[PDB]
Amino acid sequence: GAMGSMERASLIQKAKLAEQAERYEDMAAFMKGAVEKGEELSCEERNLLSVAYKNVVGGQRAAWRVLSSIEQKSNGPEVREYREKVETELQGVCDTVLGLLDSHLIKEAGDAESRVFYLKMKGDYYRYLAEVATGDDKKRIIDSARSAYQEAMDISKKEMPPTNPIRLGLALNFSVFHYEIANSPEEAISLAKTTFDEAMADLHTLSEDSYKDSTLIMQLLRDNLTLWT
Amino acid sequence: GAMGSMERASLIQKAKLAEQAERYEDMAAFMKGAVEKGEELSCEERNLLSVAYKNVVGGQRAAWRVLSSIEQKSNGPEVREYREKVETELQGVCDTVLGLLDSHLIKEAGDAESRVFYLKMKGDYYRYLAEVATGDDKKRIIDSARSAYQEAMDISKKEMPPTNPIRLGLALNFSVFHYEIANSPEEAISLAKTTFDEAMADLHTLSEDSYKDSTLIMQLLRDNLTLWT
Amino acid sequence: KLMFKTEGPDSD
């Protein structure tokens, strides 16, 4: 623990500064440090954790695709070697995040909003592994993503309203999992449509602030349906 | 030398891939490796080196300014500590680049286009140090930047045409040094104007391709003069 | 690759 000697509150303060500086690698290390303090995370802290690693892994995924595309076109070892380098570092980030979730974020998360959040993240990071998987564990990696998403979905449906932004973001990502990872485009479409319609019918219950939060994610579901249909 | 066991040509290939992937930290490490092979760099290779480190140090400078600004407003230790962290890493990059230039890029660079290029870079990386310097070596850091720029300028004026893009980029950066580091805005203005006018009067000698290269940098000189006058 | 909309920062 590089961050073992820094106060929890200082690590959270520094994560927030790192976000402002666009130093996402630092933001992610600071939030890793905070989780390793062993206390549960607040809503805000969960969002810091997620944003930090999304940003880190986002850069690696983007780099991977560029390198993978060049490699495909090329089909010397250099292209493959460098795509492998980036891929390995990507897998490491996913491994680290899954690490934090299993030791011990998920088992201590009893509230719907925390448990759903973490299980969604678990699905997400298995999905990122799945995006680069080519060998004898691909099927199991994919099934790990499905399993995580499905538990999250079951909890979300039982414990949260249809407009709950966490529930909506989960359905969005599970929908993309179906479309592109499980090669189940009809499932992806059905999930996205059903999720949008059930959210639309519940907007009447919300404040203006909540309405804004929900409709933002509903538009993402719409954006995908437009490309898909 | 992390890159001691990779072929020079592979390191250059991988720098180019890293540029395409926007992996500038990797691009910079690969080019460090290439310089440490001990052979001189080609024009293209010099440009790879410069682009890689410009990008790395650019992110750090941007982060530093964000953190410095928050710290100024705040005037707990956390803001200062984290600005210091970023500042130290920034200084390290500058130290590394200056390292490569003195061991042994500059002493082996005999052609105007290579020597001017490297001395410009030396000025640049001392300027970046100067931007964050606050102690008893600030004056000497500033003078190191001036000294490098001035030798570059003397060579460029004697050996290159006024429209030479390297010469123009040097004058641009030396001009900004004067304005903002040496607190010499009149010198900055005189240099930028004289450089623009002498370039304008030489454009007639150029091909279309060269004309494009020169006028691009001339517009930067103009952009600065507009803000300055 | 065409990337579909997923939750949170479009960091890739």
Next chain:
Amino acid sequence: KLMFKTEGPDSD
């Protein structure tokens, strides 16, 4: 800070 135009990538 207002940053002035310098050579090469506007990376900051």
